[PDB]
Amino acid sequence: RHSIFAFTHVLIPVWIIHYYLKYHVTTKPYTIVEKKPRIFPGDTILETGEV
Amino acid sequence: SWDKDVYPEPPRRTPAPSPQTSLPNPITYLTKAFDLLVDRPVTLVREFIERQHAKNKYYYYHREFRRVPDITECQEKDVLCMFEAEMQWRRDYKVDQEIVNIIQERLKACQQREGESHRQNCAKELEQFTQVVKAYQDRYHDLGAHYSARKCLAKQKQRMLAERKAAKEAAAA
Amino acid sequence: APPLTLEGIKDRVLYVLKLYDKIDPEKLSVNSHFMKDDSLDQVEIIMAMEDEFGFEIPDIDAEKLMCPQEIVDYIADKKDVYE
Amino acid sequence: RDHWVHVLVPMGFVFGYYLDRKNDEKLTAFRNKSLLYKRELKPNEEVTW
Amino acid sequence: SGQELIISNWHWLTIQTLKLSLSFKMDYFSMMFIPVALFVTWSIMEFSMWYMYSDPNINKFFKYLLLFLITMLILVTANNLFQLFIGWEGVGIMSFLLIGWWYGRADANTAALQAILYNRIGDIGFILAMAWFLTNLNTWDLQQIFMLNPSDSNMPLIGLALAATGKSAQFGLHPWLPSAMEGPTPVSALLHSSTMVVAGIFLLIRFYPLTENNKYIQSITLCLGAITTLFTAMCALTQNDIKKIIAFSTSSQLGLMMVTIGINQPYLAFLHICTHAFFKAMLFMCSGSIIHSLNDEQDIRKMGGLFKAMPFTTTALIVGSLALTGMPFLTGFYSKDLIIEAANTSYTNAWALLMTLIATSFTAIYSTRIIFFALLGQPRFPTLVNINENNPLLINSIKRLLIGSLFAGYIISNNIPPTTIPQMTMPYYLKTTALIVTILGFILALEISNMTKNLKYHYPSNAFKFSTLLGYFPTIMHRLAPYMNLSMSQKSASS
Amino acid sequence: EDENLYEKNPDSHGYDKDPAVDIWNMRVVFFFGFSIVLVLGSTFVAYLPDYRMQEWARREAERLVKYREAHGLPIMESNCFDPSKIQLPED
Amino acid sequence: MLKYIIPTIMLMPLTWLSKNNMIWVNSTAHSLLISFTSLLLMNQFGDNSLNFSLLFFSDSLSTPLLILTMWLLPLMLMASQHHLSKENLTRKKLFITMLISLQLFLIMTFTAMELILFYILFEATLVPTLIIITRWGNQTERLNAGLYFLFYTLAGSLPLLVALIYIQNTVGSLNFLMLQYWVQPVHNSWSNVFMWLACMMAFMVKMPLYGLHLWLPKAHVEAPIAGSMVLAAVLLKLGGYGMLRITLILNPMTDFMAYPFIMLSLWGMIMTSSICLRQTDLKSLIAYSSVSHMALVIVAILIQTPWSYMGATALMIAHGLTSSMLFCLANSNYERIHSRTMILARGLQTLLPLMATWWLLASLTNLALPPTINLIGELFVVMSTFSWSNITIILMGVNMVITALYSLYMLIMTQRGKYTYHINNISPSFTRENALMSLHILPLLLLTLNPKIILGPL
Amino acid sequence: LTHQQKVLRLYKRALRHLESWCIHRDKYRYFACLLRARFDEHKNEKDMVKATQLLREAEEEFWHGQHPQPYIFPESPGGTSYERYECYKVPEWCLDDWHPSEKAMYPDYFAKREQWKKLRRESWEREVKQLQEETPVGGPRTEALPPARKQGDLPPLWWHIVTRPRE
Amino acid sequence: TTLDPAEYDISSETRKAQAERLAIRSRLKREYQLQYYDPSRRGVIEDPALVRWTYARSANIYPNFRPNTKTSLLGALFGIGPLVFWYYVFKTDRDRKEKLIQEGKLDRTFNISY
Amino acid sequence: ASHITKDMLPGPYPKTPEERAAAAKKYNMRVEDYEPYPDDGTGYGDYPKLPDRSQQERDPWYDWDHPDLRLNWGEPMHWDLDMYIRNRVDTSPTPVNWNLMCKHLF
Amino acid sequence: GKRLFIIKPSGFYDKRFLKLLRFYILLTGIPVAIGITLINVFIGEAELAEIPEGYVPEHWEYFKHPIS
């Protein structure tokens, strides 16, 4: 056990910092700024296809 | 939150992963387990505050000012009329600072979006941002009278040079 | 991590009496005084411990090293030997 | 006695603060300004003088 | 699918036009180097549990070293040039707490004084490139720098190049690593292998979309790294310490990576960093068990053969030493070979290819020098042979590395999105002869080592030119620059 | 001729001067120095109100820019502060 | 200050009125209670400006500057008790009152509302500091250094009365800095040059130059008991801020003759750093360091145009905490070794391991570790004078390189062996030695969390 | 230093400089007796310049080509890790001030600690009784009588008689 | 370079009565160790070699000094020398930059900072 | 409170034999190659009688130096010649002046 | 066996130090932390634009914060 020596270590600060990001995107006008698709064909996420 | 016209970006356009292979991939084991170990300690407590934060409301109000004089009032050695004009001009400058910060991150919206092309597209932010900051240091930046803050006694007199020497001493414009 | 006591040097000073082929293993053990057995008999007799011990043998170590147990005496002061 | 060397001396702060409003109550020159700060019709620019 | 990110967490102070808050960078180096950098540190502390086993001051070490990772990790995650300057100095201030670990010792504390001296020259170059971005570019976030490339990048990037010379051990600052070895052994296994020397060139790697033009840059870059190879080759000859022999050998690795910038090869250069970090943190630690076994000589003198009840660590060295010959198919084959054969198509000095490829032999003769003098001959070293190799704490460290070490260049490069175009033409008499250059180094060192061992007794002649085994640079500059400025130029214009 | 004081350590602890009520000189400087100033005064300026009217001008900048972007109004004007109000003496 | 001078003057009829040795614990107790009143009514907003009440206070609106003025009096009484307790009680209490009286003039100063009340308060000091050098100091050659402590500041400051009354009778009245809206320009003449000359030269007497600064390593070398008023002399040197008040207006356009003040403070900057690597005194060691990066701020002001007022606001308090903390290190290690010469201190770091951390972080504020309050302002001095020309980074950057050696030149002197001596110096760093050594970095890095308040107008 | 023992200071280092250059052990050992034949040139003679010209030509070929980074025997005046053990560094008598509950440990050690001090507290009726007597006026190296003519305690008591042990 | 350093010379029999220069210091060394070894000292040694060092270095150089030679007036070639030279650099500076700033332009148009 | 020969004085020829050693024993009996003649050249602000410079120099280098501590660490009594430049400086090695590094850089 | 006695200067005053340093900073710092948590939950601010506030505007307390 390996019951609380790691659970106090890693398993507790997971929920706190994820709350600090879900309460962050709706407030700050620049959230995560993820880039473009980089897609060579045309796929089902769009309606058209490419050869 | 905010208004989307202030911060525009094109829509997201996320494609399909296209696995195509019968080999076992680890991405079908990660998103199917880790989502519930986050939603339970976060979202329910976020809901528990959501009913508790709606117990009472508190108000804070906008501050809108009053601007009766603008520039040319009044006579030289005065004090009274030349104090409100300072409150005019100086609060007409700290507004003009953070307007540029909107347009600065507007450039930053394009650059970390495309990335690959990033120069030959977006059609505005290399132009329009340079149609602001270029139209900024002239007559609104007291270069180098910004130390004494140039309060109504040099910010008009750069604009005296912007009308006397400029546009008439071009011989003959 | 391995310690050391008095008995290790009492082997080696007596052993090099027989290791040097000029000195037979029939002399006295700890006090032979080396005159009954100028250079190369005050330096060569400790040039072997220059090979084995070899802590550079300073200038005052020559005039003390006549009494062969007085050789052994100050090493325990240098090597910090037990008790 | 009751230790006037002690905390009676920091009690002089509000003794100074009671005198600290006498200067402001004779600086009652201007109500009619244009920084809103107007003293238009309200009992809010009148108060705390 | 990429999805590179920046964030917008918390404001710093704001000024007139620009506002920096904090942000991060997750492009090609955060998802690559950070699991590599942590894996080494995960495997290095078990030796320090055995190396620093007799010290009641053990708790300061694990505390000080962890914050040294923080200044090494916040630099690579940064995307504000203010944040880069934070990590640029934070890495050096920890070093004074690491070379200055052992108190007293009138050279090692001077070696702590020698350490921070040459670090500050690399500091003054980086701030010069900073202020030119303030004067023109209106900010110093790394986005808007790469938004528009300026015309005259010649003036800022020399300060970027001079900043690289402060910590990446270029010519003129070369005694910084052979002086920094005076501390404890896994200290120097960290200080010299995967930290404190990769960040000296890492800042140049981030600046790839600008370094193409402005042709004064590229000729200076590749010619500089060529000088760093052979002066470390000539001064390593007749060197009588194990740690000092490995000290020069990481510097000729730096002579490769400086040249890889001038040729427009960004990611193949960085992949050599991806492989090299495995090597000497193993090797100083593998050789550290040998020195602790004897507990006081640390010389290449008085060693013996390999097999004096020493099975395993001799097997661990020949994995490393054969890789250090120049990678026939070992650990760093997919990085070393794809660069010297990328020197085929180039526009160099052409003195550069007549200088970089010769050191490939000089790298190979470093290998057998510890084989032929510590692992080959008759057993000789002083008595009370107190050797010990039985500690599973050390066995856990060595086994964890060599599994990852051999599969280093063969798993990472096996799955990577491509960035550039390969050579794909390597003609007759021009293709793989640098491997043959490594082969003759075995031959030439043989007829010197065996000739110094079994010959017709070449008698010791006192007549030799020995300005090669010293270099003559620490002989005078450590006797002149703290003499002219410190004494005569002061006490004349002092009191 | 020469009388002086030396290391005050008569095997007691010592804080500033001596044993008793000068013993209270510790917790009059530990408790008043920090733990009230370094805590409450550190808290006081933490959430302190808007410095130099900034937080108004943050969201005020958010409002008026899109109104210039609404109809026709150019941005970064530098427009002589409502012209034809100056005689502009030539020479 | 509505009632800030008012509570602290009541602290004065409390020293000789009190009992016996209770006078130390009583004086420190009341003193920290004013520190909240300083914080409370100040730090308000904030947009040009806070004219406070009347003709005696303008509330220190553009630069706060006043919080640092009030730490020191509940900070030196715990320091001065090292070697003071040998005299009569009535004589020791007088030494307490004169330091408290030093703060009251400086409480009205730095705000001062005016200029004719400025100069009488600008000269209201130098009376209590001089008496501290005369009685209860150290060994001889005090009295000439007391005379060199005069006859410079008084020599240069007298043409200010020649300058200011010449302004008061000419254009309006200098009672109000805010009635300075109409300011006539100043052309190049042979009369106006001297008008700018007397306006400036008196302020170079306090913050020093490469000239006229020989007196500064006399008061810090020959100094009172254990850095007692020496900490106050730190604020006495940095408190020449009034150039920010005056030359912001009132002949701003004379920059044609700015150059020999730019140049002399620049080659003298790089020189006086290296003028102490062969010094043999500890209290002189920090003194010449306190010349160099205090001479950094002068070219930030005569060069106008902010991004220079930003850092110069912070660089006054930069060494103002740091050199005050270094003197606290130097006031210690003297009650135990009764000579201040640094060479005799071989063999440290082993007897005192607890204060050895405090040597590290203190000298880590000269290398200065760029997330601090020191290298956040020195980057803005870079940001200003590089726009002047491209050469200015050279001599200013080597200043960041010489003090890299010059700070670690002190740290390595602690690490030596076998110590040869010292049946005395036993005391393992008692409570007064380390609690007083605290409360310096404890607000300093605290201010590095949100450094928004340390900013001028600007 | 004298002329005859000036030979001895060179003779040990003549061979000590050679094993720096050797690769084997017998290769160095074969040149021990081989260099001895040069030393056996003038076996026993007068002490004049004939013995100095054997040393006057020992200026060259001894300093000339001398020890290209030799063996140093690391616990030495030079050499690496020569004074490395300095985190401990033996602070003898750092143990005056304790303010106990820190002097709780080692009870018998402190009971013996004050015991040895009486040997130092009472020596100047004996050591200073001979200190004025053994020194003639102001002459040479000032060790006492090494038995002090009744009981030598120490003479160098106690900072040298309880000097710092190494670890 | 710095130095040869001449670690060997001749003897036998130059200056036979020159010996016992250690008798000067061993008398002081006997005066040292007798001061060093005592049952109660509790303080530093006076050590007047350091007393005569700093005070005859920091002070008592200006009473020694006279301007009777020009090699004492030689400090004019080091103090005021480069101090004119930096201004001789800088007076040529800032005006050539200004003429290109007054007549003609070279800067970028987005130079708000500065 | 040491007043008798508390420092140097206006030397160096005010009966220089009575300087060393009536006090400040840099020389034993004014013939030790360290009599206070070595006032470099005077007239300047150098050292006067000055128990100071051109005495045998260029290193205290922390030698073997066992007859006292006496090298640089452990306080020999009165042998001050020069200081503050020597805690980091040394004596001569086996090679000599030859500036081959400029030829090596050539 | 090999057993000796380690020589330390003193640990009393040094471990007596950091006590009241740690003690008093938790005597009022940790109790004041709850008020930073209690005012976060039960008290907020809402919302914007503007409000009209009648004719005469509101007093001081125009802040969007609990204690500001």
In sequence order, what E strands does B64-168 have? none
Helix (H, G, I), strand (E, B) or coil at E141: strand
CB atoms near residue E327 (< 10 Å) = 21
Give the contacts of E421 (CB within 8 A, at least 6 positions apart): none
Cβ–Cβ gap B15/A33 under 8 Å: no
Catalytic residue among C11, C21, C37, C38: C38
User: Cα(G158)–Cα(G152) distance, rounded to whole angstroms?
Assistant: 10
Q: Which amino acid is at G273?
A: S
Tokens of B161: 């040079």
What is the DSSP annotation of E176-237? HHHHHTTS-HHHHHHHTTTSSSSHHHHHHHHTTTTTTS-THHHHHHHHHHHHHHHHHHHHSS
Give the contacts of B153 (CB within 8 A, at least 6 positions apart): G181
Q: How far is CA E211 from CA E15, E82, G26, I14, K51, in A?
A: 31, 21, 68, 72, 55
CB atoms near residue G450 (< 10 Å) = 16
For residue G382, give the nearest of F10, E130, F27 by alpha carbon: E130
Longest dimension (CA), chain G: 72
Q: Which residue of A has its CA nearest to B2?
A: A29
Give the contacts of E100 (CB within 8 A, at least 6 positions apart): E108, E109, E112, E183, G415
In this structure, what are the phi and psi dihedrals at residue G229, rounded to the nearest 5 degrees?
-85, -5
Candidates G255, G303, G339, G398: best to mutate against I (most CBs of I within 10 A) is: G339
Radius of gyration of chain B (CA): 27
User: Cα(I85)–Cα(I89) distance, rounded to whole angstroms?
Assistant: 6
Candidates G288, G359, G374, G412: best to mutate against E (most CBs of E within 10 A) is: G412
Residues 65-124 of chain H with CB under 8 A from chain J are: 66-67, 77
Helices (H), G169-201: 192-201
- The secondary structure of residue A9, as a DSSP letter, is I
- The secondary structure of residue H163, as a DSSP letter, is P
C-beta separation of E13 from G452 below 8 A: yes
Nearest to J100 among E110, E472, E482 (CB): E472
CB atoms near residue E84 (< 10 Å) = 21
Give the contacts of B148 (CB within 8 A, at least 6 positions apart): B154, G248, G249, G252, G304
User: Cα(G203)–Cα(G214) distance, rounded to whole angstroms?
Assistant: 16
Element at B124 (helix H, strand E): none
Peptide bond into A2 cis (omega under 30): yes
Radius of gyration of chain D (CA): 18
For residue G327, give the nearest of G75, G67, G29 by alpha carbon: G75
For residue E183, give the nearest of E249, E104, E116 by alpha carbon: E104
CB atoms near residue E22 (< 10 Å) = 15
Give the contacts of F22 (CB within 8 A, at least 6 positions apart): F15, F16, G21, G22, G24, G25
Residue with tokens 């020694």: I64
Q: How far is CA E76 from CA E86, E88, G376, in A?
A: 11, 11, 22
- Exposure string of G326-339, with b = 16+ CB inside 10 Å and e = fewer, is bbbbbbbbbbbbeb
Give the contacts of E365 (CB within 8 A, at least 6 positions apart): E441, E444, E445
User: Cα(E8)–Cα(E48) distance, rounded to whole angstroms?
Assistant: 39
Element at E35 (helix H, strand E): helix E30-42
Facing residues of G348 across strands? Answer: G415
Tokens of G209: 């130059």
C-beta separation of E445 from E368 below 8 A: yes
User: Cα(G65)–Cα(B99) distance, rounded to whole angstroms?
Assistant: 31
Give the contacts of B102 (CB within 8 A, at least 6 positions apart): B6, F61, F62, F65
Tokens of G390: 């491209």
Please count the CA atoms within 13 angstroms of the CA of G311 that sit on its side-chain side: 26
Residues of K with Cβ-Cβ distance to G351 under 8 angstroms = 9
User: Cα(G34)–Cα(G25) distance, rounded to whole angstroms?
Assistant: 16
Helix (H, G, I), strand (E, B) or coil at H107: helix
Residue with tokens 């005299």: G87
Nearest to I39 among H47, H121, H135 (CB): H121
Facing residues of G415 across strands? Answer: G348
- The secondary structure of residue G202, as a DSSP letter, is G
Tokens of I83: 């101090």
- The secondary structure of residue E102, as a DSSP letter, is S
Q: How far is CA F80 from CA B154, B161, B172, in A?
A: 12, 10, 21
Q: Which residue of H has its CA nearest to E297?
A: H74
Breaks (C-N over 2.5 A) in chain I follow: none
Tokens of E247: 């000290």
In sequence order, what E strands does chain D have? none
Q: Which amino acid is at E410?
A: Y
Cβ–Cβ gap E5/A30 under 8 Å: no
Residues of K with Cβ-Cβ distance to D41 under 8 angstroms = 55-56
Q: Does I26 touch chain H (CB under 8 A)?
A: yes
Cβ–Cβ gap H142/I26 under 8 Å: yes
Please give, rounded to a whole number of angstroms, the shortest distance from the CA of H44 to a CA of chain C.
9
C-beta separation of A30 from B9 below 8 A: no
Distance of CA G360 to the CA centre of its chain: 22
Give the contacts of G135 (CB within 8 A, at least 6 positions apart): none
Q: How was it solved?
A: cryo-EM
For residue E365, give the nearest of E237, E453, E253, E240 by alpha carbon: E237
Q: Which amino acid is at G435?
A: A
- Exposure string of J19-43, with b = 16+ CB inside 10 Å and e = fewer, is bbbeebbbbbebebebbbbbbeebb
User: Cα(E365)–Cα(E443) distance, rounded to whole angstroms?
Assistant: 9
In this structure, what are the phi and psi dihedrals at residue K9, rounded to the nearest 5 degrees?
-65, -60
User: Cα(G85)–Cα(G92) distance, rounded to whole angstroms?
Assistant: 8
Tokens of E209: 């979309």
Please give, rounded to a whole number of angstroms, the shortest distance from the CA of G306 to a CA of chain D.
28
User: Cα(G277)–Cα(G405) distance, rounded to whole angstroms?
Assistant: 9
In this structure, what are the phi and psi dihedrals at residue B167, rounded to the nearest 5 degrees?
70, 0
Instruction: Tell which phi-psi region holds residue B9, choosing left (phi > 0), alpha (psi between -120 and 50) or beta.
Output: beta
Tokens of E32: 């690559």
User: Cα(G295)–Cα(G372) distance, rounded to whole angstroms?
Assistant: 20
User: Cα(B131)–Cα(F3) distance, rounded to whole angstroms?
Assistant: 81
User: Cα(G382)–Cα(G396) distance, rounded to whole angstroms?
Assistant: 8
Q: Which amino acid is at J24?
A: A
C-beta separation of E69 from E190 below 8 A: no
In sequence order, what E strands does E43-187 have? none
Q: Which amino acid is at E218?
A: Q
Helix (H, G, I), strand (E, B) or coil at A16: helix
Helix (H, G, I), strand (E, B) or coil at E299: strand
C-beta separation of G148 from G214 below 8 A: yes
Cα separation of the two ends of chain F: 88
User: Cα(G330)–Cα(G336) distance, rounded to whole angstroms?
Assistant: 12
Tokens of G432: 């007064």
Give the contacts of E471 (CB within 8 A, at least 6 positions apart): E231, E234, E235, J101
CB atoms near residue G150 (< 10 Å) = 12
Helix (H, G, I), strand (E, B) or coil at G348: strand
Facing residues of E141 across strands? Answer: E80
Facing residues of E14 across strands? Answer: E19
User: Cα(K46)–Cα(K33) distance, rounded to whole angstroms?
Assistant: 24
Helix (H, G, I), strand (E, B) or coil at B24: coil
Element at K59 (helix H, strand E): none
Residue with tokens 């402590």: G149
User: Cα(E214)–Cα(E160) distance, rounded to whole angstroms?
Assistant: 14
Helices (H), E407-471: 408-411, 433-449
Contact between chain B and chain G (3 or more Cβ pairs less than 8 Å apart): yes
- Exposure string of E400-433, with b = 16+ CB inside 10 Å and e = fewer, is bbbebbeebbeebbeeeeeeeeeeeeeeeeeeee
C-beta separation of I79 from J27 below 8 A: no
Resolution in A: 8.3
For CA atoms H132, H135, H139, H143, give the dihedral sign. negative
User: Cα(J58)–Cα(J40) distance, rounded to whole angstroms?
Assistant: 16
Q: How many residues does chain B have?
A: 173
User: Cα(G452)–Cα(G458) distance, rounded to whole angstroms?
Assistant: 12
Q: How far is CA J91 from CA E188, H70, J66, in A?
A: 29, 18, 19
- The secondary structure of residue I73, as a DSSP letter, is G
For residue I114, give the nearest of E136, E144, B155 by alpha carbon: E136
User: Cα(G12)–Cα(G101) distance, rounded to whole angstroms?
Assistant: 8
User: Cα(F43)–Cα(F25) distance, rounded to whole angstroms?
Assistant: 26
- The secondary structure of residue F39, as a DSSP letter, is I
C-beta separation of C64 from C71 below 8 A: yes
In terms of CATH, what superfamily is C8-79?
Answer: ACP-like (1.10.1200.10)
Q: Which amino acid is at C59?
A: D
- Exposure string of I12-38, with b = 16+ CB inside 10 Å and e = fewer, is eeeeeeeeeeeebbbbbbbebbeebbe
Three-point CA angle G50, G56, G60, nearest 5° = 40
C-beta separation of E395 from E401 below 8 A: no
Element at I13 (helix H, strand E): none
Determine whether C38 is an active site residue. yes
User: Cα(I9)–Cα(H56) distance, rounded to whole angstroms?
Assistant: 10
Q: For chain E, percent helix, then strand, then coil, each to nearest 5?
A: 60, 0, 40
Nearest to G78 among F16, F40, F51 (CB): F16
Residue with tokens 């001062």: G112
Q: How far is CA H24 from CA E69, G120, H21, in A?
A: 45, 88, 10
User: Cα(H84)–Cα(B119) distance, rounded to whole angstroms?
Assistant: 59
Residue with tokens 């006279």: I66
Give the contacts of F3 (CB within 8 A, at least 6 positions apart): none
C-beta separation of J60 from J86 below 8 A: yes
User: Cα(E248)–Cα(E178) distance, rounded to whole angstroms?
Assistant: 8
- The secondary structure of residue G209, as a DSSP letter, is -
Residues of E with Cβ-Cβ distance to I113 under 8 angstroms = 16-18, 134-135, 138
C-beta separation of H120 from H157 below 8 A: yes
Helix (H, G, I), strand (E, B) or coil at H99: coil
Please count the CA atoms within 13 angstroms of the CA of E223 that sit on its side-chain side: 10
Q: Does B112 touch chain E (CB under 8 A)?
A: yes
Please count the CA atoms within 13 angstroms of the CA of C35 that sit on its side-chain side: 4
Facing residues of E299 across strands? Answer: E241
Residues of J with Cβ-Cβ distance to C60 under 8 angstroms = 66
Nearest to H138 among I27, I33, I36 (CB): I27
For residue B162, give the nearest of I98, F85, F88 by alpha carbon: F88
Tokens of B106: 């507007």
Three-point CA angle H72, H74, H75, nearest 5° = 120
Q: How far is CA A27 from CA A23, B60, E10, E278, K50, in A?
A: 7, 17, 12, 44, 19
In this structure, what are the phi and psi dihedrals at residue J57, rounded to the nearest 5 degrees?
-150, -155
Instruction: Tell which phi-psi region holds residue G172, choosing left (phi > 0), alpha (psi between -120 and 50) or beta.
Output: left
Q: Which amino acid is at J15?
A: K
Longest dimension (CA), chain I: 88
User: Cα(B12)–Cα(E3) distance, rounded to whole angstroms?
Assistant: 11
C-beta separation of G289 from G406 below 8 A: yes
For residue G192, give the nearest of G165, G167, G157 by alpha carbon: G167
Nearest to C43 among H4, H8, H77 (CB): H8
Cα separation of the two ends of chain G: 23
Residue with tokens 């699918």: E1
What long-range pairs does D3-6 form, CB within 8 A, spacing at least 24? D5/G14, D5/G17, D5/G18, D5/G26, D6/G26
